[PDB]
Amino acid sequence: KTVIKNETGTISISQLNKNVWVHTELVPSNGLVLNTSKGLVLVDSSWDDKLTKELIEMVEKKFQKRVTDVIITHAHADRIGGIKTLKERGIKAHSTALTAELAKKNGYEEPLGDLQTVTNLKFGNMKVETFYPGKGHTEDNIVVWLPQYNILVGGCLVKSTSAKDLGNVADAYVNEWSTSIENVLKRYRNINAVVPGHGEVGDKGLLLHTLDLLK
Ligand SMILES: [Co+2]
Ligand SMILES: [Co+2]
């Protein structure tokens, strides 16, 4: 897997296949870059507007196409923090209605609130399903599924192997989180890669790890 850095190390992209890359920025955080025939689509942007601009510029230059859309997986600063940049550049910022209203309540500009419990999007050739499994890391957390690759973007709902505890639970629902993870396992019975919110890429084992952290 080919791995390309910004100058400073603060942003890194790692290839999963011909058209899917994982983006990581610095505490580490992950999203996806989807290289589609109609433009670049991100699953999550970054901690703040500075890193989000850097991410966008790196990918636009490398892939020679514009970022057209971003899927925001919950309303916390690490996910929603580059919203201002997205809005001012005319990048469509997709979210559930709940994610949008939490973003507003917390002083952020609002994403679209277009995503339902299950939403199916097509960006050129690239199919993307978004799924709200229930409450867990936050009230609003969603997952993203790429049916052409069986790749799940878990976000902070899903903990990496390295994670030895649940992290920030101030906004979490620790008695629902297990049912939510089960909902994902029931929906996606054959998973090739699982991208956690933070940490290394794994497989279904990361969902099982999260279940154990919840005991
Ligand atoms: Co969060
Ligand atoms: Co997080």
PDB file of N, CA, C and O in Angstrom, residues 126-197:
ATOM      1  N   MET A 126     -18.739   5.382  -8.285  1.00  0.00           N
ATOM      2  CA  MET A 126     -18.527   4.984  -6.863  1.00  0.00           C
ATOM      3  C   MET A 126     -19.843   4.969  -6.073  1.00  0.00           C
ATOM      4  O   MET A 126     -20.500   5.994  -5.937  1.00  0.00           O
ATOM      5  N   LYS A 127     -20.205   3.810  -5.511  1.00  0.00           N
ATOM      6  CA  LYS A 127     -21.425   3.660  -4.730  1.00  0.00           C
ATOM      7  C   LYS A 127     -21.054   3.818  -3.282  1.00  0.00           C
ATOM      8  O   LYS A 127     -20.082   3.255  -2.834  1.00  0.00           O
ATOM      9  N   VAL A 128     -21.889   4.557  -2.555  1.00  0.00           N
ATOM     10  CA  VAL A 128     -21.652   4.806  -1.122  1.00  0.00           C
ATOM     11  C   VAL A 128     -22.990   4.670  -0.398  1.00  0.00           C
ATOM     12  O   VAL A 128     -23.981   5.287  -0.788  1.00  0.00           O
ATOM     13  N   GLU A 129     -23.015   3.843   0.650  1.00  0.00           N
ATOM     14  CA  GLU A 129     -24.155   3.735   1.516  1.00  0.00           C
ATOM     15  C   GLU A 129     -23.802   4.320   2.872  1.00  0.00           C
ATOM     16  O   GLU A 129     -22.753   4.008   3.431  1.00  0.00           O
ATOM     17  N   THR A 130     -24.693   5.163   3.370  1.00  0.00           N
ATOM     18  CA  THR A 130     -24.541   5.636   4.760  1.00  0.00           C
ATOM     19  C   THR A 130     -25.586   4.942   5.613  1.00  0.00           C
ATOM     20  O   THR A 130     -26.716   4.721   5.137  1.00  0.00           O
ATOM     21  N   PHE A 131     -25.247   4.620   6.860  1.00  0.00           N
ATOM     22  CA  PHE A 131     -26.109   3.862   7.762  1.00  0.00           C
ATOM     23  C   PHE A 131     -26.001   4.377   9.179  1.00  0.00           C
ATOM     24  O   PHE A 131     -24.889   4.549   9.707  1.00  0.00           O
ATOM     25  N   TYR A 132     -27.131   4.795   9.737  1.00  0.00           N
ATOM     26  CA  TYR A 132     -27.242   5.165  11.148  1.00  0.00           C
ATOM     27  C   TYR A 132     -27.667   3.911  11.924  1.00  0.00           C
ATOM     28  O   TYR A 132     -28.822   3.452  11.801  1.00  0.00           O
ATOM     29  N   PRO A 133     -26.759   3.346  12.697  1.00  0.00           N
ATOM     30  CA  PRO A 133     -27.032   2.108  13.421  1.00  0.00           C
ATOM     31  C   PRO A 133     -27.630   2.271  14.799  1.00  0.00           C
ATOM     32  O   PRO A 133     -27.949   1.275  15.449  1.00  0.00           O
ATOM     33  N   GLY A 134     -27.803   3.498  15.235  1.00  0.00           N
ATOM     34  CA  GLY A 134     -28.104   3.771  16.617  1.00  0.00           C
ATOM     35  C   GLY A 134     -27.020   4.528  17.374  1.00  0.00           C
ATOM     36  O   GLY A 134     -25.927   4.832  16.838  1.00  0.00           O
ATOM     37  N   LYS A 135     -27.310   4.839  18.637  1.00  0.00           N
ATOM     38  CA  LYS A 135     -26.392   5.646  19.467  1.00  0.00           C
ATOM     39  C   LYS A 135     -25.212   4.812  19.910  1.00  0.00           C
ATOM     40  O   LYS A 135     -25.307   3.585  20.156  1.00  0.00           O
ATOM     41  N   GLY A 136     -24.062   5.464  20.060  1.00  0.00           N
ATOM     42  CA  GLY A 136     -22.893   4.780  20.560  1.00  0.00           C
ATOM     43  C   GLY A 136     -21.853   5.747  21.111  1.00  0.00           C
ATOM     44  O   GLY A 136     -22.063   6.319  22.216  1.00  0.00           O
ATOM     45  N   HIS A 137     -20.794   6.025  20.320  1.00  0.00           N
ATOM     46  CA  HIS A 137     -19.773   7.011  20.674  1.00  0.00           C
ATOM     47  C   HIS A 137     -20.426   8.408  20.861  1.00  0.00           C
ATOM     48  O   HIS A 137     -20.132   9.135  21.793  1.00  0.00           O
ATOM     49  N   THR A 138     -21.408   8.695  19.994  1.00  0.00           N
ATOM     50  CA  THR A 138     -22.292   9.811  20.155  1.00  0.00           C
ATOM     51  C   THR A 138     -23.723   9.363  19.759  1.00  0.00           C
ATOM     52  O   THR A 138     -23.946   8.262  19.253  1.00  0.00           O
ATOM     53  N   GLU A 139     -24.666  10.268  19.967  1.00  0.00           N
ATOM     54  CA  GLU A 139     -26.050  10.072  19.626  1.00  0.00           C
ATOM     55  C   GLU A 139     -26.266   9.842  18.122  1.00  0.00           C
ATOM     56  O   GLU A 139     -27.184   9.158  17.683  1.00  0.00           O
ATOM     57  N   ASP A 140     -25.455  10.529  17.353  1.00  0.00           N
ATOM     58  CA  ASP A 140     -25.655  10.746  15.921  1.00  0.00           C
ATOM     59  C   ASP A 140     -24.755   9.926  15.009  1.00  0.00           C
ATOM     60  O   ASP A 140     -24.933   9.975  13.791  1.00  0.00           O
ATOM     61  N   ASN A 141     -23.768   9.210  15.578  1.00  0.00           N
ATOM     62  CA  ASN A 141     -22.741   8.563  14.758  1.00  0.00           C
ATOM     63  C   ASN A 141     -23.293   7.689  13.655  1.00  0.00           C
ATOM     64  O   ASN A 141     -24.223   6.860  13.834  1.00  0.00           O
ATOM     65  N   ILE A 142     -22.753   7.910  12.462  1.00  0.00           N
ATOM     66  CA  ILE A 142     -23.071   7.013  11.342  1.00  0.00           C
ATOM     67  C   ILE A 142     -21.848   6.226  10.872  1.00  0.00           C
ATOM     68  O   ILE A 142     -20.729   6.617  11.113  1.00  0.00           O
ATOM     69  N   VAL A 143     -22.106   5.164  10.085  1.00  0.00           N
ATOM     70  CA  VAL A 143     -21.058   4.453   9.390  1.00  0.00           C
ATOM     71  C   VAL A 143     -21.256   4.614   7.901  1.00  0.00           C
ATOM     72  O   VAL A 143     -22.382   4.919   7.439  1.00  0.00           O
ATOM     73  N   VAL A 144     -20.198   4.363   7.155  1.00  0.00           N
ATOM     74  CA  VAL A 144     -20.223   4.471   5.712  1.00  0.00           C
ATOM     75  C   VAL A 144     -19.695   3.156   5.124  1.00  0.00           C
ATOM     76  O   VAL A 144     -18.695   2.646   5.534  1.00  0.00           O
ATOM     77  N   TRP A 145     -20.388   2.692   4.113  1.00  0.00           N
ATOM     78  CA  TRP A 145     -20.116   1.384   3.489  1.00  0.00           C
ATOM     79  C   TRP A 145     -19.906   1.573   1.989  1.00  0.00           C
ATOM     80  O   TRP A 145     -20.672   2.276   1.345  1.00  0.00           O
ATOM     81  N   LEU A 146     -18.858   0.932   1.454  1.00  0.00           N
ATOM     82  CA  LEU A 146     -18.581   0.955   0.024  1.00  0.00           C
ATOM     83  C   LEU A 146     -18.876  -0.464  -0.514  1.00  0.00           C
ATOM     84  O   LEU A 146     -18.053  -1.357  -0.338  1.00  0.00           O
ATOM     85  N   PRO A 147     -20.085  -0.665  -1.041  1.00  0.00           N
ATOM     86  CA  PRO A 147     -20.522  -2.027  -1.428  1.00  0.00           C
ATOM     87  C   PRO A 147     -19.668  -2.651  -2.520  1.00  0.00           C
ATOM     88  O   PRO A 147     -19.696  -3.885  -2.657  1.00  0.00           O
ATOM     89  N   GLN A 148     -18.937  -1.853  -3.300  1.00  0.00           N
ATOM     90  CA  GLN A 148     -18.079  -2.419  -4.409  1.00  0.00           C
ATOM     91  C   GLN A 148     -16.760  -3.013  -3.910  1.00  0.00           C
ATOM     92  O   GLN A 148     -16.042  -3.733  -4.664  1.00  0.00           O
ATOM     93  N   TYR A 149     -16.451  -2.800  -2.624  1.00  0.00           N
ATOM     94  CA  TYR A 149     -15.178  -3.154  -2.001  1.00  0.00           C
ATOM     95  C   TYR A 149     -15.344  -3.871  -0.641  1.00  0.00           C
ATOM     96  O   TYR A 149     -14.372  -4.290  -0.031  1.00  0.00           O
ATOM     97  N   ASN A 150     -16.573  -3.880  -0.140  1.00  0.00           N
ATOM     98  CA  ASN A 150     -16.919  -4.313   1.215  1.00  0.00           C
ATOM     99  C   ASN A 150     -16.024  -3.691   2.275  1.00  0.00           C
ATOM    100  O   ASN A 150     -15.433  -4.334   3.139  1.00  0.00           O
ATOM    101  N   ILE A 151     -15.910  -2.365   2.160  1.00  0.00           N
ATOM    102  CA  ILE A 151     -15.109  -1.573   3.075  1.00  0.00           C
ATOM    103  C   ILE A 151     -16.084  -0.747   3.925  1.00  0.00           C
ATOM    104  O   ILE A 151     -17.014  -0.089   3.415  1.00  0.00           O
ATOM    105  N   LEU A 152     -15.922  -0.916   5.220  1.00  0.00           N
ATOM    106  CA  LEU A 152     -16.688  -0.147   6.217  1.00  0.00           C
ATOM    107  C   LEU A 152     -15.805   0.935   6.874  1.00  0.00           C
ATOM    108  O   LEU A 152     -14.711   0.652   7.412  1.00  0.00           O
ATOM    109  N   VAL A 153     -16.342   2.167   6.856  1.00  0.00           N
ATOM    110  CA  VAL A 153     -15.823   3.292   7.625  1.00  0.00           C
ATOM    111  C   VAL A 153     -16.616   3.351   8.909  1.00  0.00           C
ATOM    112  O   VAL A 153     -17.803   3.665   8.911  1.00  0.00           O
ATOM    113  N   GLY A 154     -15.977   2.932   9.974  1.00  0.00           N
ATOM    114  CA  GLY A 154     -16.584   2.833  11.265  1.00  0.00           C
ATOM    115  C   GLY A 154     -16.703   4.137  12.012  1.00  0.00           C
ATOM    116  O   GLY A 154     -17.590   4.283  12.860  1.00  0.00           O
ATOM    117  N   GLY A 155     -15.764   5.062  11.789  1.00  0.00           N
ATOM    118  CA  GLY A 155     -15.686   6.276  12.582  1.00  0.00           C
ATOM    119  C   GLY A 155     -15.474   6.014  14.056  1.00  0.00           C
ATOM    120  O   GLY A 155     -14.968   4.961  14.436  1.00  0.00           O
ATOM    121  N   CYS A 156     -15.812   6.973  14.925  1.00  0.00           N
ATOM    122  CA  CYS A 156     -15.516   6.748  16.312  1.00  0.00           C
ATOM    123  C   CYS A 156     -16.425   5.732  16.999  1.00  0.00           C
ATOM    124  O   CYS A 156     -16.136   5.323  18.126  1.00  0.00           O
ATOM    125  N   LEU A 157     -17.484   5.261  16.305  1.00  0.00           N
ATOM    126  CA  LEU A 157     -18.206   4.114  16.774  1.00  0.00           C
ATOM    127  C   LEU A 157     -17.318   2.856  16.957  1.00  0.00           C
ATOM    128  O   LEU A 157     -17.636   1.957  17.760  1.00  0.00           O
ATOM    129  N   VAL A 158     -16.235   2.785  16.175  1.00  0.00           N
ATOM    130  CA  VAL A 158     -15.365   1.609  16.095  1.00  0.00           C
ATOM    131  C   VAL A 158     -13.982   1.942  16.551  1.00  0.00           C
ATOM    132  O   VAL A 158     -13.350   2.851  16.029  1.00  0.00           O
ATOM    133  N   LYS A 159     -13.531   1.169  17.539  1.00  0.00           N
ATOM    134  CA  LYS A 159     -12.195   1.384  18.142  1.00  0.00           C
ATOM    135  C   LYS A 159     -11.134   0.502  17.501  1.00  0.00           C
ATOM    136  O   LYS A 159     -11.416  -0.618  17.117  1.00  0.00           O
ATOM    137  N   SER A 160      -9.924   1.039  17.336  1.00  0.00           N
ATOM    138  CA  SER A 160      -8.820   0.288  16.799  1.00  0.00           C
ATOM    139  C   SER A 160      -8.280  -0.715  17.861  1.00  0.00           C
ATOM    140  O   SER A 160      -8.508  -0.550  19.069  1.00  0.00           O
ATOM    141  N   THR A 161      -7.558  -1.706  17.372  1.00  0.00           N
ATOM    142  CA  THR A 161      -6.878  -2.685  18.283  1.00  0.00           C
ATOM    143  C   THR A 161      -6.055  -1.997  19.368  1.00  0.00           C
ATOM    144  O   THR A 161      -6.027  -2.436  20.541  1.00  0.00           O
ATOM    145  N   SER A 162      -5.369  -0.943  18.981  1.00  0.00           N
ATOM    146  CA  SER A 162      -4.512  -0.211  19.903  1.00  0.00           C
ATOM    147  C   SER A 162      -5.287   0.433  21.027  1.00  0.00           C
ATOM    148  O   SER A 162      -4.712   0.649  22.084  1.00  0.00           O
ATOM    149  N   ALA A 163      -6.582   0.744  20.797  1.00  0.00           N
ATOM    150  CA  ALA A 163      -7.419   1.395  21.772  1.00  0.00           C
ATOM    151  C   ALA A 163      -7.766   0.444  22.913  1.00  0.00           C
ATOM    152  O   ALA A 163      -8.443  -0.570  22.701  1.00  0.00           O
ATOM    153  N   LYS A 164      -7.351   0.806  24.128  1.00  0.00           N
ATOM    154  CA  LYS A 164      -7.572  -0.064  25.288  1.00  0.00           C
ATOM    155  C   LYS A 164      -8.686   0.422  26.183  1.00  0.00           C
ATOM    156  O   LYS A 164      -8.953  -0.152  27.258  1.00  0.00           O
ATOM    157  N   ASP A 165      -9.391   1.453  25.740  1.00  0.00           N
ATOM    158  CA  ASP A 165     -10.561   1.904  26.462  1.00  0.00           C
ATOM    159  C   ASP A 165     -11.409   2.676  25.460  1.00  0.00           C
ATOM    160  O   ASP A 165     -10.994   2.848  24.320  1.00  0.00           O
ATOM    161  N   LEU A 166     -12.549   3.191  25.921  1.00  0.00           N
ATOM    162  CA  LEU A 166     -13.577   3.775  25.007  1.00  0.00           C
ATOM    163  C   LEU A 166     -13.276   5.214  24.594  1.00  0.00           C
ATOM    164  O   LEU A 166     -13.948   5.762  23.708  1.00  0.00           O
ATOM    165  N   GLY A 167     -12.314   5.844  25.270  1.00  0.00           N
ATOM    166  CA  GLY A 167     -11.992   7.241  25.053  1.00  0.00           C
ATOM    167  C   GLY A 167     -13.012   8.173  25.673  1.00  0.00           C
ATOM    168  O   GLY A 167     -13.568   7.901  26.744  1.00  0.00           O
ATOM    169  N   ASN A 168     -13.348   9.236  24.946  1.00  0.00           N
ATOM    170  CA  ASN A 168     -14.281  10.251  25.433  1.00  0.00           C
ATOM    171  C   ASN A 168     -15.710   9.747  25.427  1.00  0.00           C
ATOM    172  O   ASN A 168     -16.287   9.611  24.332  1.00  0.00           O
ATOM    173  N   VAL A 169     -16.272   9.499  26.611  1.00  0.00           N
ATOM    174  CA  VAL A 169     -17.652   9.072  26.772  1.00  0.00           C
ATOM    175  C   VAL A 169     -18.643  10.102  27.266  1.00  0.00           C
ATOM    176  O   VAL A 169     -19.781   9.771  27.557  1.00  0.00           O
ATOM    177  N   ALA A 170     -18.227  11.384  27.324  1.00  0.00           N
ATOM    178  CA  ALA A 170     -19.145  12.425  27.779  1.00  0.00           C
ATOM    179  C   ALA A 170     -20.394  12.494  26.975  1.00  0.00           C
ATOM    180  O   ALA A 170     -21.484  12.728  27.522  1.00  0.00           O
ATOM    181  N   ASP A 171     -20.271  12.217  25.669  1.00  0.00           N
ATOM    182  CA  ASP A 171     -21.395  12.297  24.783  1.00  0.00           C
ATOM    183  C   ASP A 171     -21.868  10.928  24.306  1.00  0.00           C
ATOM    184  O   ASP A 171     -22.695  10.827  23.375  1.00  0.00           O
ATOM    185  N   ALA A 172     -21.457   9.870  24.998  1.00  0.00           N
ATOM    186  CA  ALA A 172     -21.712   8.487  24.520  1.00  0.00           C
ATOM    187  C   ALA A 172     -22.889   7.843  25.239  1.00  0.00           C
ATOM    188  O   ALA A 172     -23.390   8.343  26.290  1.00  0.00           O
ATOM    189  N   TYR A 173     -23.339   6.725  24.664  1.00  0.00           N
ATOM    190  CA  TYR A 173     -24.457   5.940  25.127  1.00  0.00           C
ATOM    191  C   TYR A 173     -23.934   4.516  25.273  1.00  0.00           C
ATOM    192  O   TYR A 173     -24.066   3.722  24.364  1.00  0.00           O
ATOM    193  N   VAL A 174     -23.342   4.209  26.427  1.00  0.00           N
ATOM    194  CA  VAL A 174     -22.575   2.991  26.535  1.00  0.00           C
ATOM    195  C   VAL A 174     -23.459   1.749  26.652  1.00  0.00           C
ATOM    196  O   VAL A 174     -22.960   0.699  26.435  1.00  0.00           O
ATOM    197  N   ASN A 175     -24.757   1.916  26.966  1.00  0.00           N
ATOM    198  CA  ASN A 175     -25.724   0.791  27.009  1.00  0.00           C
ATOM    199  C   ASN A 175     -26.471   0.527  25.737  1.00  0.00           C
ATOM    200  O   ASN A 175     -27.202  -0.488  25.656  1.00  0.00           O
ATOM    201  N   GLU A 176     -26.339   1.457  24.786  1.00  0.00           N
ATOM    202  CA  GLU A 176     -26.814   1.293  23.405  1.00  0.00           C
ATOM    203  C   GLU A 176     -25.735   0.901  22.413  1.00  0.00           C
ATOM    204  O   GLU A 176     -26.011   0.215  21.411  1.00  0.00           O
ATOM    205  N   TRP A 177     -24.509   1.355  22.687  1.00  0.00           N
ATOM    206  CA  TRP A 177     -23.384   1.215  21.765  1.00  0.00           C
ATOM    207  C   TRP A 177     -23.239  -0.239  21.318  1.00  0.00           C
ATOM    208  O   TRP A 177     -22.972  -0.498  20.126  1.00  0.00           O
ATOM    209  N   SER A 178     -23.439  -1.192  22.218  1.00  0.00           N
ATOM    210  CA  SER A 178     -23.288  -2.617  21.821  1.00  0.00           C
ATOM    211  C   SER A 178     -24.344  -3.010  20.789  1.00  0.00           C
ATOM    212  O   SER A 178     -24.041  -3.704  19.796  1.00  0.00           O
ATOM    213  N   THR A 179     -25.592  -2.593  20.998  1.00  0.00           N
ATOM    214  CA  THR A 179     -26.702  -2.880  20.042  1.00  0.00           C
ATOM    215  C   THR A 179     -26.421  -2.228  18.698  1.00  0.00           C
ATOM    216  O   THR A 179     -26.664  -2.815  17.652  1.00  0.00           O
ATOM    217  N   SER A 180     -25.864  -1.011  18.726  1.00  0.00           N
ATOM    218  CA  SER A 180     -25.488  -0.324  17.506  1.00  0.00           C
ATOM    219  C   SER A 180     -24.437  -1.088  16.716  1.00  0.00           C
ATOM    220  O   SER A 180     -24.527  -1.197  15.491  1.00  0.00           O
ATOM    221  N   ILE A 181     -23.415  -1.569  17.409  1.00  0.00           N
ATOM    222  CA  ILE A 181     -22.368  -2.388  16.768  1.00  0.00           C
ATOM    223  C   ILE A 181     -22.985  -3.664  16.205  1.00  0.00           C
ATOM    224  O   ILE A 181     -22.682  -4.063  15.080  1.00  0.00           O
ATOM    225  N   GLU A 182     -23.858  -4.288  16.989  1.00  0.00           N
ATOM    226  CA  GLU A 182     -24.573  -5.470  16.462  1.00  0.00           C
ATOM    227  C   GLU A 182     -25.365  -5.145  15.226  1.00  0.00           C
ATOM    228  O   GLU A 182     -25.409  -5.951  14.320  1.00  0.00           O
ATOM    229  N   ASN A 183     -25.987  -3.967  15.173  1.00  0.00           N
ATOM    230  CA  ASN A 183     -26.712  -3.550  13.984  1.00  0.00           C
ATOM    231  C   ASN A 183     -25.838  -3.479  12.748  1.00  0.00           C
ATOM    232  O   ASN A 183     -26.237  -3.838  11.658  1.00  0.00           O
ATOM    233  N   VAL A 184     -24.623  -2.989  12.915  1.00  0.00           N
ATOM    234  CA  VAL A 184     -23.659  -2.942  11.810  1.00  0.00           C
ATOM    235  C   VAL A 184     -23.261  -4.376  11.373  1.00  0.00           C
ATOM    236  O   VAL A 184     -23.204  -4.674  10.180  1.00  0.00           O
ATOM    237  N   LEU A 185     -22.981  -5.235  12.356  1.00  0.00           N
ATOM    238  CA  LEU A 185     -22.593  -6.643  12.063  1.00  0.00           C
ATOM    239  C   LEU A 185     -23.694  -7.396  11.345  1.00  0.00           C
ATOM    240  O   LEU A 185     -23.403  -8.228  10.474  1.00  0.00           O
ATOM    241  N   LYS A 186     -24.940  -7.098  11.688  1.00  0.00           N
ATOM    242  CA  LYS A 186     -26.146  -7.743  11.034  1.00  0.00           C
ATOM    243  C   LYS A 186     -26.359  -7.224   9.599  1.00  0.00           C
ATOM    244  O   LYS A 186     -26.749  -7.969   8.677  1.00  0.00           O
ATOM    245  N   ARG A 187     -26.079  -5.939   9.378  1.00  0.00           N
ATOM    246  CA  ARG A 187     -26.250  -5.338   8.079  1.00  0.00           C
ATOM    247  C   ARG A 187     -25.144  -5.767   7.128  1.00  0.00           C
ATOM    248  O   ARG A 187     -25.443  -6.004   5.939  1.00  0.00           O
ATOM    249  N   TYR A 188     -23.907  -5.868   7.626  1.00  0.00           N
ATOM    250  CA  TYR A 188     -22.697  -6.109   6.790  1.00  0.00           C
ATOM    251  C   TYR A 188     -22.016  -7.345   7.272  1.00  0.00           C
ATOM    252  O   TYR A 188     -21.148  -7.312   8.089  1.00  0.00           O
ATOM    253  N   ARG A 189     -22.462  -8.490   6.713  1.00  0.00           N
ATOM    254  CA  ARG A 189     -22.029  -9.788   7.197  1.00  0.00           C
ATOM    255  C   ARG A 189     -20.669 -10.250   6.598  1.00  0.00           C
ATOM    256  O   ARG A 189     -20.009 -11.163   7.122  1.00  0.00           O
ATOM    257  N   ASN A 190     -20.227  -9.594   5.519  1.00  0.00           N
ATOM    258  CA  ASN A 190     -18.981  -9.944   4.843  1.00  0.00           C
ATOM    259  C   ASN A 190     -18.171  -8.652   4.639  1.00  0.00           C
ATOM    260  O   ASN A 190     -18.376  -7.928   3.650  1.00  0.00           O
ATOM    261  N   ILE A 191     -17.236  -8.407   5.536  1.00  0.00           N
ATOM    262  CA  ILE A 191     -16.465  -7.138   5.539  1.00  0.00           C
ATOM    263  C   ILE A 191     -15.003  -7.405   5.205  1.00  0.00           C
ATOM    264  O   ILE A 191     -14.385  -8.240   5.859  1.00  0.00           O
ATOM    265  N   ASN A 192     -14.458  -6.739   4.168  1.00  0.00           N
ATOM    266  CA  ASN A 192     -13.027  -6.790   3.883  1.00  0.00           C
ATOM    267  C   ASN A 192     -12.083  -5.958   4.671  1.00  0.00           C
ATOM    268  O   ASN A 192     -11.005  -6.404   4.988  1.00  0.00           O
ATOM    269  N   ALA A 193     -12.430  -4.702   4.902  1.00  0.00           N
ATOM    270  CA  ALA A 193     -11.618  -3.801   5.740  1.00  0.00           C
ATOM    271  C   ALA A 193     -12.576  -2.937   6.553  1.00  0.00           C
ATOM    272  O   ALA A 193     -13.657  -2.546   6.054  1.00  0.00           O
ATOM    273  N   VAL A 194     -12.155  -2.635   7.775  1.00  0.00           N
ATOM    274  CA  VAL A 194     -12.897  -1.692   8.649  1.00  0.00           C
ATOM    275  C   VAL A 194     -11.927  -0.562   9.009  1.00  0.00           C
ATOM    276  O   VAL A 194     -10.829  -0.819   9.505  1.00  0.00           O
ATOM    277  N   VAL A 195     -12.324   0.695   8.722  1.00  0.00           N
ATOM    278  CA  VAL A 195     -11.491   1.841   9.005  1.00  0.00           C
ATOM    279  C   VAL A 195     -12.039   2.433  10.329  1.00  0.00           C
ATOM    280  O   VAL A 195     -13.173   2.961  10.385  1.00  0.00           O
ATOM    281  N   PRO A 196     -11.284   2.346  11.433  1.00  0.00           N
ATOM    282  CA  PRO A 196     -11.741   2.975  12.662  1.00  0.00           C
ATOM    283  C   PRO A 196     -11.594   4.509  12.624  1.00  0.00           C
ATOM    284  O   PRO A 196     -10.853   5.038  11.773  1.00  0.00           O
ATOM    285  N   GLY A 197     -12.244   5.206  13.542  1.00  0.00           N
ATOM    286  CA  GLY A 197     -12.127   6.648  13.644  1.00  0.00           C
ATOM    287  C   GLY A 197     -10.719   7.096  13.886  1.00  0.00           C
ATOM    288  O   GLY A 197     -10.275   8.051  13.301  1.00  0.00           O
TER     289      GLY A 197
END
